[PDB]
């Protein structure tokens with residue numbers, strides 16, 4: 001297990017998200033679905049010139065999996081997945097300018113729901129989650145687990161859990177007062193409201 005510090009500005013954004021009183025928390029789900037859709041776009045495009053890139057799984061989709069017992073909400077996609085370099089460096093590097101600009105906008109009166117317009121919507125997960133675990137597998141690399149409970153650091157390790165094939169699974173370990181996002185009706189409401197124009201099937205797994 002390796003431990004890394006977030007980029008300074010990303011650590012600052014995460015602290016703001018965690019400590020600002022903000023009731024409209026449901027935006028996190030829209031942002032995570034949008035990121036999954038982008039990842040799916042990437043593998044779909046690559047497969048147009050090289051169909052063998054889908055040998056790790058032909059189905060392109062997003063699954064939403066609430067678990068009341070574990071108090072987790074998992075967002076699974078079969079997109080392109082992330083390499084180790086993506087996890088440690090690249091996603092942080094792409095997000096730097098958007099992060100800086102978003103924090104400036106927040107100081108100039110913008111609201112947290114605009115986070116997606118700056119390309120850093122992933123961090124809105126911390127509106128509802130005390131910890132986030134991300135399992136990922138890219139065709140060109142091993143399966144990895146990324147994890148952060150904020151506080152300025154994240155970890156990356158090789159994952160020896162169940163093989164994913166290809167894609168990314170975001171596991172939100174929800175705060176005690178945020179269990180509404182494990183309810184079927186609530187999840188459906190949010191998806192219908194925010195994510196009606198996504199070009200891949202979104203399936204809610206109903207709890208037994």
Ligand SMILES: O=C(c1cc(-c2nnc3ccc(Br)cn23)c(O)cc1O)N1CCc2ccccc2C1
Nearest residue numbers: 032035036039077079080081082091122134146168
């Ligand atoms: O595989 C993915 C992907 C990434 C994120 C995601 N978005 N922001 C972050 C921040 C940290 C972590 Br861990 C995951 N993040 C996500 O929510 C879902 C995903 O399917 N991607 C997402 C973006 C991307 C960009 C370039 C190349 C590959 C990929 C692959």
